[PDB]
Amino acid sequence: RKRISNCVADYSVIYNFAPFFAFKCYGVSPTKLNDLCFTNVYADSFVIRG
């Protein structure tokens, strides 16, 4: 678990990273993350079967 705060967030690197297999957002629209402001950001990573 990683906590992200007190920084400027850019999400172009997300598309630059890899040709994603899946990209699903629930509370927000993926094309409008560029215009929102958030209190805290939590980053969680692990490995799962395909």
Partner: protein, 49 residues
Amino acid sequence: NHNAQALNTLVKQLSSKFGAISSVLNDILSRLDPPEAEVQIDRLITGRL
């Protein structure tokens, strides 16, 4: 007194959610896609009507 009570209640009713994500239209518009906005907007419309 009755007129003031009625007007105050009517203006107070604008802060209800009616089972939606938020009670402000601008927040809904600026956080979502039009295809996913009608579902939220309908509840507010019905409550205010």
